[PDB]
Design a protein around this nucleic acid. Structure first.
Length: 123
DNA sequence: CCACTAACCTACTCACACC
DNA sequence: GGTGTGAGTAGGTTAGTGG
């Protein structure tokens, strides 16, 4: 289980992220997609940052003191059956395995990761 | 050495289609 | 109401960044 290579923000990207977070710490998919392209970062990395930034901000605010969701990804029985056989072998695929499963299904890798998180909690 | 943090994780919830 | 499952939330853990 290897994780994806950790990126490192440029100052231009950091500024853009904080400015948008300041306006709304709960962006929807459209805001995240626009921001992602505006600063040259894949949208899933942006979503992960907004999650971490909120947990930061809430943790300091604890010791000092709705936009539209992504559209539901349609998953065929063909794709599900292939994800299910992978899931029985390994419930914690690394980035390589997720990228293989994304290639074989045609689904985005970020969606493969969510599918495994949900599947682990319910089976 | 060690503080910070992207990446990843659990747990619970919301959304929404379907019966 | 009940079921199923994709996408949200809070917040904890793992491992790379860089002082």
């Amino acid at each position: 289980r290897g994780r994806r290579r950790r990126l490192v923000w440029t100052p231009s990207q950091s500024e853009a992220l904080r400015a948008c977070f300041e306006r709304n710490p709960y962006p929807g998919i459209a805001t995240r997609e626009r921001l992602a392209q505006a600063i040259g970062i894949p949208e899933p990395r942006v979503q992960i940052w907004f999650q971490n930034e909120r947990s930061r901000q809430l943790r300091q605010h604890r010791r000092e003191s709705p936009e539209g969701r992504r559209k539901r990804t349609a998953v065929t029985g063909s794709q599900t059956a292939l994800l299910l056989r992978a899931f029985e072998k390994d419930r914690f695929p690394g980035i390589a395995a997720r990228e293989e499963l994304a290639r074989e299904t045609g689904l985005p890798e970020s969606r493969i990761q969510i599918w495994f998180q949900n599947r682990r909690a319910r089976h």
